[PDB]
Symmetry: C5
Subunit: 206 residues, 5 copies
């Protein structure tokens, strides 16, 4: 396990072959989860890109967080999709947290510590545990078929994932960088592999 | 009685079928009242919705607080209506307090602790105490005929009601969340019934 | 004499019938004056209205403070007018102080403690002491002939008048609500009569 | 010599006839200077006006600071002109400092303590000491030929002039009103003559 | 060496002929570098200009930092170019740090302490040490062929250069003016030659 504190992955050129694969130790299906991350990119006015793609053998978009051009954030579970439209965007590092709960279908989406309205999505589903998690690309089969036009360019980091819904109070401590203990992906104890032009560099966000 | 402190009702999907009904202990007709609540919704740009609906067997819109598409807040007593127009809306949680006084007809409306101008409505009227209070829906009979196009989607909470007009100094401490004690409807001692898809979740507003 | 501190007059409906008349112990003619007041209205986009009207039996507009639609504040003395144009208006409570001096014709106008540029009006004139001061309406004759289309709707208060020009440092004290002593017309010792629908209510402004 | 501290000249009517003349004790020609002043006027959207006109027997615009409509500040030395364009202007009191140096032609212009970029003007020139300094008017002969369409309306004060270039760290203390001592023209010790409608009043700026 | 602390170069006229040449003691080629500088100019709306030009006898634009009209900052290494577009520009002093690393091609560009997204440029290249560094102009041959249409007008200073990539934490202390030690080019220990109309004056930025 590597402590990636103060470090970020950099995807400095558009590619369909550069990516990093994050390994989860998870062995029980997710009835709920939270994932939080920092990313920075200038693509937001140019094109859509995949922020965080989670796939399973049955389903290539089992969880996906995606920016869609002129729409805003797209969040999808089990291939069903909802939109958190953004009316205007500025170039700066952005923190997001998203969480979902099978027992209720409630999605929370948080941007820079400000909550979006809760929306229903894909109630009663279960997310598979046998998963391929990739940053930098959108994956259209388990671990592959990346499209260069959906790749991320820029930086991503502080990727943390929990198998439960963080409360609003906890999410505030994540945004402020307080102490917390992830249990699916932990940025302070990450297990990962890198392919192609990807670099680990000091983070640009404070 | 349930203490709903730090908790909110979530109406995560559009329907006419799901609502919450609040029970008042009141047994004397209201010569005056105050209502305060937090709500959060993205509908404000798409369509109108009912924020708080109070009906009596004679009159479905005995008190109604409503958002009118591209108009702003609509406040109506006894079926007579006035508008507090809003020229542009931010998407964030919003606190409102409203109050009315039969002896003068003066309405006050407060948005995020800022007072709107005082207006006149239904001087000399009285509001019935045999009442059905419903959240999430607009009702057109004593307890039903809900219109799905008027339902709320999003969150509501801190719904408090007083049988008297709060002063400007008190309303400020309501907004800042100081000590106070309602007497018609108390969020710390709520009586309610939930129908359909409604969830109680931690509040998103601070 | 009534201490109106923390209280305001409320004019909740458009009418020509409702007004309040303020009495001054004047005997010496006014070689100069200052008048300060708080008011709050939504009319500023809809139509003009009379903020403060001082009439004498020779002259209905002996002092007038008026809002002119799409123009801004109009200030008139002895029936002659100067405009303090406002390029864009916002709906909030607003404090104004205005002062005039016969020996120079210098008019000062202050809005929320921001001074407007000094202007010249009616140098060498004198304002009559045998005066009718009315709030809520525009006098077109001594004490009467009100025009409903010129009535104020909303709130007015902290009306204070001095028979001398307050210095900039004093006026800042008035705006911040420090200690001061009016000598023509004092809100802490007001003499008035109410006619029609006018109410005294707690002030909305701080 | 009069201490004008916290006083200002008021030019409340447009005219060609009213002005004040300031006398300098200077007896050696200026190889460099600084002049700082406060002024306040609403003309900025209506027309140009002379802020500070310095003339010598040979040259009526030996130093001139002039607002030019929809352009911004014009600064001229020896009849040669440069512009410091202002793209949008606001109604508030404004402090300017300007300074020039013969040995380099460097002009510095400062507005509310913010420096404009340094520019070159009339390197090697020499400003005459036999000077008529006039506030309120632009002058086209030594001490006369004023044009009413170039008069200032509003207020001017804190006019201070030095026969050397103030450093950036000094200019900041002029703007903040720290201790300083001019030597060509000193507001603490002014010699002046007033003609026509001009008044000395408490200053509007803090 | 000259300590240029709190001092800046002023280029007050457009010309082909005024420039300063800075001497680097470097004697090993650069696999990476950082350069930071302050500049101030009004040209940004009018035309492009060269902020910092590094040339070698093989290559006129070996490092170049350039502003291109209505595009934004251009940064080039080895004659290959990337853009950090600026959608709107403001007239104030601006501090930029830029850095590059051959081992990765990562470019970092920082404007007023805010990072732009990292980009890829000239991976595996090697910047020559036999170099001519010029301020005020762009050179198109080693030490010459300046074009007046590309000259800088205004101010430049605090030009510091390092033969390594500064971390994000170090770059913040550069921007805040903490203690630091450049090793290719040091503003506190500068060697330079001045040609034509260039002046050394106190800096306008704080
Ligand atoms: C978010 N999206 C709908 C644009 C893409 C979803 O994944 P995919 O269909 O491109 O593989
Ligand atoms: C006044 N209103 C537009 C908000 C609602 C009127 O129709 P209804 O909600 O009573 O059915
Ligand atoms: C002040 N005013 C110019 C707008 C109106 C004057 O006419 P009136 O209001 O006295 O009838
Ligand atoms: C050129 N100017 C408009 C800045 C000043 C004019 O001075 P003048 O030529 O009117 O006397
Ligand atoms: C390429 N540039 C436009 C940014 C700088 C100028 O290049 P060049 O004029 O030396 O050929
Ligand atoms: Ca996919
Ligand atoms: Ca895809
Ligand atoms: Ca109804
Ligand atoms: Ca209905
Ligand atoms: Ca009248
Ligand atoms: Ca009238
Ligand atoms: Ca002239
Ligand atoms: Ca002239
Ligand atoms: Ca070149
Ligand atoms: Ca060139």
């Amino acid at each position: 396990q590597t402590d990636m504190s103060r470090k970020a992955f950099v995807f400095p050129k558009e590619s369909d072959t550069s990516y990093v694969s994050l390994k989860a130790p998870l062995t029980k299906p997710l009835k709920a989860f939270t994932v939080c991350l920092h990313f920075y990119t200038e693509l937001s006015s140019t094109r859509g890109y995949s922020i965080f793609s989670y796939a399973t053998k049955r389903q290539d978009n089992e969880i996906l967080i995606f920016w869609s051009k002129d729409i805003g954030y797209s969040f999808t579970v089990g291939g069903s999709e909802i939109l958190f439209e953004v009316p205007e965007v500025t170039v700066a590092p952005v923190h997001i947290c998203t969480s979902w709960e099978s027992a209720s279908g409630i999605v929370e989406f948080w941007v820079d510590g400000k909550p979006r309205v809760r929306k229903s999505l894909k109630k009663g589903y279960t997310v598979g545990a046998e998963a391929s998690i990739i940053l930098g690309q959108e994956q259209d089969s388990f671990g592959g078929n990346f499209e260069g036009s959906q790749s991320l360019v820029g930086d991503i980091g502080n990727v943390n994932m929990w198998d439960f819904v963080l409360s609003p109070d906890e999410i505030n401590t994540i945004y402020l960088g307080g102490p917390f203990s992830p249990n699916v992906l932990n940025w302070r104890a990450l297990k990962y592999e890198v392919q192609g032009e990807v670099f680990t560099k000091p983070q640009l966000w404070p």
